[PDB]
Write an enzyme that holds these catalytic residues in place. Structure first.
Site, mmCIF file in Angstrom:
data_model
loop_
_atom_site.group_PDB
_atom_site.id
_atom_site.type_symbol
_atom_site.label_atom_id
_atom_site.label_comp_id
_atom_site.label_asym_id
_atom_site.label_seq_id
_atom_site.Cartn_x
_atom_site.Cartn_y
_atom_site.Cartn_z
ATOM 1 N N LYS A 164 0.863 -1.233 0.000
ATOM 2 C CA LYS A 164 0.000 0.000 0.000
ATOM 3 C C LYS A 164 0.873 1.247 0.000
ATOM 4 C CE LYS A 164 -0.831 -0.272 5.049
ATOM 5 N NZ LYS A 164 -1.700 -0.522 6.277
ATOM 6 N N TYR A 169 9.465 33.598 4.748
ATOM 7 C CA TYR A 169 8.168 34.208 4.925
ATOM 8 C C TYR A 169 7.997 34.583 6.395
ATOM 9 C CZ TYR A 169 6.482 32.975 0.201
ATOM 10 O OH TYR A 169 6.280 32.944 -1.160
#
Lengths: 367, 367
Positions: B40, B263
């Site tokens: 998976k 930022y």
């Protein structure tokens, strides 16, 4: 991760919303201003190719983060200019000339490495990056810019543009932004020759500092209908969120008081209740910190109970529902809505990250 | 996101590590036990196809989360049995039958819906899921299970297996684990015909509860060399991590005291220092909560300073290094190492999520 079309989990992308968003930004910037659609990171998880094709006739160019993102657009048939915004590898000057890309140049050392390798630079178009205070990439002093400009032109590179980027355009305070704007202007003012295309404006600069726009804007978050400030600042006009995220119920059970759900058994039913299973999990980018956040079913908030698994979440329903009932994770359902911003706030992150981490396992559907 | 090979950020997957980890598990379980490789979510971000091909001869089957992951293995020519662990859509079962996938069946409502569509189920192979306290999917009552097994056999379905899954195999306390185990055994004891292939053991159960193994183990985290408990329990024997994450410096500068990075300008140099930029960011799954964590450069810890950007991080170097110098984000570098567990602990998550979120923009290379 591979797109899973046989699982009911999907992201819906409203391309018209993106077009409308571009229109509303267009209506509020000066007439000659070029519009550059930033479609880096697979258009912020919305799908770079599908988005670029939808909006090409409404923009002047695209911006991407790396040459492979540009190559992807060229192979799909996009024909407008593409600017790569970050540093490129020396081994990609030749590609830029072959695919017709514009590269960002940000430092002297990089240029000197390219010259040492002795690559032909004749057809190349570049923008010079100025670091006016974001401290990330770019020339930080006027003398550095000019030395770089001299050295590039003399090896036959076309220096077409020059740009900077703002760290704080989306905050209430304008002090740091003003300092950056002035730094950038002073650097431009000291050049003997300034490249023809000057740009500095991201979404937030476009939305809240419209009067500071140079020759172009670089539209990111706002194009996708996301508030660049998250929940901090009110938009000056409406933006429509392009991305919706949905799934369906694949298991529904009634559990008695005392039953535990999920890894760690961290949730325990205090009464008899309805628990449903939804095929999305953290490998899809619905991260483990979404535990206790609500999704919407039939216009109602249903909490994610117990730990998020790799591929599945369990939620508590107010009553029994059939297999296949729609689950809205981002979007509207009945009279209720969940935004990507609301999701980011819950996780203590920003809406940019929420949409980018939506994995390719979730197919994108366009309307 | 599309793989970007022209950027120096990459994930190195050591297939020999995976092989050794499977061999190591094989050495510590009964010689007759079947081993199922859980691949998976693109082998937990390691590359399901490449991992599956590398280890096919050493395992008795694969487990995936949905039919589309199963198809991806088959289309690449894997021939071993594939078990789909979660609930499959009714509309996808005919396709599964043509490809000979083994499907998980978990509820009566689901079976009923399948029979209402009058699709031929003759020769379909299924395993029944027992919910023994995971509270996720599966039959909770002994009589529910036998009604299911009966309904399926009447329509020509071959019920080859039966399984459950443990919520707390990776914890110090065994109380919840034992209640689940006894519940499972009590269910099996109540059936007149137990399906041939009984399995219950994930990595943690295999590692710490060996005496509880039935016919087969489902190897997940431990196969990738990752401790399922993170830092909580000591491994019973050595596991070798399969994934390394690296990049390179693309910009390097020296800044005086007062200079801000990223930022929000949330980091301000308090002394003259070297700052480098590395082309990996949160769109690559190096999330924003990685600010102030360190990467390795030349055997030394270098903190990530300022906010993480979508495509880039800035790090503080102890002295100048040239462009192209290797950065190790997960893996060994000189005398130091950073593990996906350490990254997970920093983020307050688990190592499964760290590796799963590394986006496809990062190319995988296989060694």
């Amino acid at each position: 991760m591979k797109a899973s079309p046989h699982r009911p989990t999907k992201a819906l992308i409203h391309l018209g919303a993106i077009r409308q968003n571009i229109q509303q930004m267009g209506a509020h910037i000066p007439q000659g201003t070029l519009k550059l659609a930033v479609v880096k990171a697979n258009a912020y998880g919305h799908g770079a190719v599908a988005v670029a094709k939808a909006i090409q006739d409404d923009v002047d160019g695209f911006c991407v983060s790396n040459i492979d993102e540009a190559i992807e657009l060229r192979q799909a048939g996009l024909s407008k200019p593409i600017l790569i915004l970050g540093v490129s590898e020396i081994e990609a000057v030749a590609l830029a000339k072959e695919y017709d890309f514009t590269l960002t140049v940000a430092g002297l050392e990089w240029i000197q490495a390219l010259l040492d390798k002795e690559v032909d630079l004749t057809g190349l178009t570049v923008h010079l990056k100025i670091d006016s205070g974001m401290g990330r990439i770019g020339f930080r002093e006027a003398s550095e810019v000019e030395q770089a400009q001299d050295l590039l032109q003399q090896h036959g590179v076309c220096v077409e543009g020059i740009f900077t980027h703002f760290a704080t355009a989306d905050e209430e305070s304008d002090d740091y932004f003003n300092a950056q704007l002035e730094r950038f202007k002073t650097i431009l003012a000291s050049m003997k020759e300034v490249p023809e295309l000057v740009h500095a404006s991201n979404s937030a600069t476009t939305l809240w500092h419209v009067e500071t726009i140079f020759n172009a804007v670089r539209m990111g978050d706002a194009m996708y209908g996301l508030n660049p400030s998250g929940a901090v600042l009110d938009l000056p006009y409406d933006l429509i969120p392009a991305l919706t995220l949905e799934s369906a119920l694949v298991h529904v059970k009634t559990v008695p008081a005392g039953a535990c759900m999920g890894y760690g058994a961290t949730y325990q039913a205090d009464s008899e209740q309805v628990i449903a299973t939804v095929p999305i999990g953290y490998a899809d980018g619905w991260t483990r910190d979404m535990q206790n956040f609500s999704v919407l079913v039939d216009g109602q908030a249903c909490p994610i109970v117990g730990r998020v698994s790799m591929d599945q979440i369990t939620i508590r329903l107010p009553k029994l529902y059939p297999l296949g009932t729609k689950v809205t994770l981002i979007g509207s359902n009945g009279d209720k809505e969940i935004t990507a911003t609301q999701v980011a706030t819950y996780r203590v992150t920003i809406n940019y990250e929420v949409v980018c981490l939506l994995s390719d396992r979730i197919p994108r559907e366009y309307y």
